[PDB]
Design a protein around this ligand. Structure first.
Ligand code: GNT
Ligand code: GNT
Ligand code: GNT
Ligand code: GNT
Lengths: 216, 213, 212, 213, 214
């Protein structure tokens, strides 16, 4: 009857929308010098799980929020029964190649590979990860604690193709595990522009810097 | 008698065909879905006090209902349900919110679909999650908690419920290193600052201690 | 050289006729199946008394029979059986009920199909399961048990049977850290109050101790 | 110049096409048996665990066989005598360690060399954990361990095995390994079991080793 | 300038289409169509040295470069595109392997490559590698020395030649706070002939001298 149809319709609209987007001019070839893209990064640090002073590797668990905007993902909500956003497999759309620059093990993914696309063409994608990176935990057992840092950025695109930005320099600590072995003294996330004599193009990274110590 | 079997097979293959490779984009605000969760806690395998991670093995029972998976048993030679690869159908993205390692899957990825459109899927998992086992060697024991919920859908798209707050303990390993004092599973609604959309999770809370002498 | 090209053609035709033409959806209440299980225990590799997990390595022999896999050897140049990738045919979802890590596969995923419709498939596996090794260092030794059965089919869909209650120990590693006192494999039938179907498993029970 | 390269490319792609289509090999049979030649090049005994009695080896396993269905006349394909191809593109034998304790790990690309006469050569580098008591490793006499390699599903009526030599190649053994090799042999064995009327073949790899001084 | 962007996208998708179809799949190099791969290492960190198994763990970037005629295009025909990024699975890549690894290589970076209009490809996987190495002496002033050959697994030097732009491993990204400090790191092209075989074999030999940080 009445209510069952309205659900069948909204389903048809969504499937039509997804079809119109993923087939009509197929998956986007990535950014270029002529069509650059800005990716916004933010970290929500959940836990420093482990600090290994025999190999100088530290393990973090965090959510990496990524946001970007494509014209080719735009639609008029009016043409698709008032749909303003949708969930889709990350495999269905282009995603940026943001990588830790000093990891020592492949990143492990803790959350579904699904993204949210909005009618204005913005995508949001928020992978939870466990990362092992190069870090000397020396001083972790003192009042001053240890300090570690890891750069995140595109692996293959320069700043002429992908720019990075953060909404804030403060890493979100409001979900930090209250009973972690390590307590967080501060955690910052900072856009850096790197330059190199050989090369006209700039390189961009977000520098994640964590100061931590053993819980008392 | 060999024919009756060939027929029931044909009906099942036709049904599966009519459902999958002829006819789901997931739930929406306009077409929301309710997932029922239940845990059967098999074993606390390991409690690592140097990293504060605990390892659990459990069965996660998931249940939901799709109109698009309905059929009339009469049209398909009285078939009322069938077994199918979980890869063949949409499944919910229920995730542990505080895991520290990817979940490991211990059982086949197979689901049961019923003529009324309900699906049941029951993955066995091993999970490492954030937990301070301090006190696990005392009479009071330790307490740990982990939220499970959709990763990408708010409570306008996916609602969660439990049939019961008591975690099923009747398959708990009698000789585990740890004994279970209590295990509850509770639907929580977090509201927020800004936002109008409520978020739903199921909070798994386990009280446990070292098994005695 | 022709004799060989012919027998090849016949085999490829047979496989074609069976797989790419005529479609097995698994067993049902109306078309139930019997799987025969047997274990050959190769080694107890490791017993961890800090987590109560034991690691076994064994061969799990699985056998079943499908009408849809039958052929007349006469129509296919006297072929009576063939080897095929396990990915090419339906296989049962036999699982350990108390494993603590995903099972690791030690052998090729290949099965043997016979003209009468029977399949035999014998994965070698390493399994970690829930087990208290307490007493392993005593004359009496430890005892551990693990049920194996279908994960999603009740006994109305898949019955289980064993040819024998004795686990095959004739390939047990003579120099394992642990010696086997006994190892049995037993069909069990179970009801639960949720459901009206019988449920069926094969219970593998191993008694072992530290090698002297 | 540039054309003679485009041509040799076209010839190779045509050859590969002509082979992997036009009669797309079902494996050996009683009527069409096959001989696989095995050889090991032992690179390193990495680890010897006396608490679980497992030893880790790294070696190259050379495999060689010959299929009529892989033959071609070099004259018909611009004088191509051999080519490199993904192992996934052709049938390969199911040679397994009979007493491994972990899945084999593959250290090298899964690529094989096919020659106009129909012969294939495939040389996977592997790390293997297998059952072995390292007792005595720390004495002048050292330890001895053994592992059989053979087909998992084919009897000796379908696959015969042979070695070109009984001596395992030791010329790439890591000079600074924790363990030095006293001897390493590879031997064809023919077995009979009473389950069965057909013979079974393996190559038994026997290693005698001790701690480096 | 919404149209400009749609056009440059169309051009790129057309180019990628024209390349990955029409004469589909380059079949790899041959005696008649040999290829030169250029290797370079950027050593990031010696992570671990295990003296109980004689395995050392390295983390490095392996730069690989080669050139295919079949990847060439005229930038003029494709709206002035001079290069593009593509999934490494979309194109042939060389089978460069460590000859004395003890565990499968672990990949730390996206499997993406850069193709340029002149037909050259660049691909720079970050890896963690465990290889056979006796760290004896690491705790002395002289330190330890280890070596690992890298080369094609299945192609002789008649099919794949290797070369380096420089003998010096790039150390400018070496982790300042690694447990181990680098005394020197060289990367050297070697040519081998054998008795088994009239073909020449080429490998690049990575040699690292290192010791415990003080
Ligand atoms: C209670 O509402 C939520 C339910 C799930 C999640 C979040 C919620 O609120 C967001 C902000 C913060 O509370 C933490 C995680 C959130 C963003 C990341 N998602 C994927 C997980
Ligand atoms: C012995 O029969 C069963 C075989 C497998 C399973 C169950 C069985 O009985 C059910 C009730 C209880 O025994 C535990 C698990 C069950 C429900 C969860 N499934 C998915 C796993
Ligand atoms: C049922 O027990 C077995 C499980 C696996 C294998 C064999 C078994 O019995 C042996 C004799 C015969 O049955 C065939 C193969 C065997 C010998 C070769 N091995 C490697 C494969
Ligand atoms: C049979 O032993 C081998 C196993 C693998 C390889 C080679 C062998 O012998 C060497 C010389 C020649 O035969 C060809 C390649 C070798 C050198 C290059 N390596 C990396 C591949």
């Amino acid at each position: 009857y009445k209510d069952d149809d309205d659900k069948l319709h909204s389903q048809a609209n969504l499937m039509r929308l997804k079809s119109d987007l993923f087939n009509r001019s197929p998956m986007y070839p990535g950014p270029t010098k002529d069509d650059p893209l800005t990716v916004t990064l933010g970290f929500t640090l959940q836990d420093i799980v482990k600090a290994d002073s025999s190999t100088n590797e530290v393990d973090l668990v965090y959510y990496e929020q990524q946001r970007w905007k494509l014209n080719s993902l735009m639609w008029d909500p009016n043409e698709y029964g008032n749909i303003t956003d949708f969930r889709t497999s990350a495999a269905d759309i282009w995603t940026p190649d943001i990588t830790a620059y000093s990891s020592t093990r492949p990143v492990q993914v803790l959350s579904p590979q699904i993204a949210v696309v909005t009618h204005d063409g913005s995508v949001m994608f928020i992978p939870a990860q466990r990362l092992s990176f190069m870090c000397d935990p020396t001083g972790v057992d003192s009042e001053e604690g240890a300090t570690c840092a890891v750069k995140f950025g595109s692996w293959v695109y320069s700043g002429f193709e992908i720019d990075l930005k953060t909404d804030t320099d403060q890493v979100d600590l409001s979900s930090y595990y209250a009973s972690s072995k390590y307590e967080i003294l501060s955690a910052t996330q900072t856009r850096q522009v790197q330059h190199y004599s050989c090369c006209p193009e700039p390189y961009i990274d977000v520098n994640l810097v964590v100061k931590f110590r053993e819980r008392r």
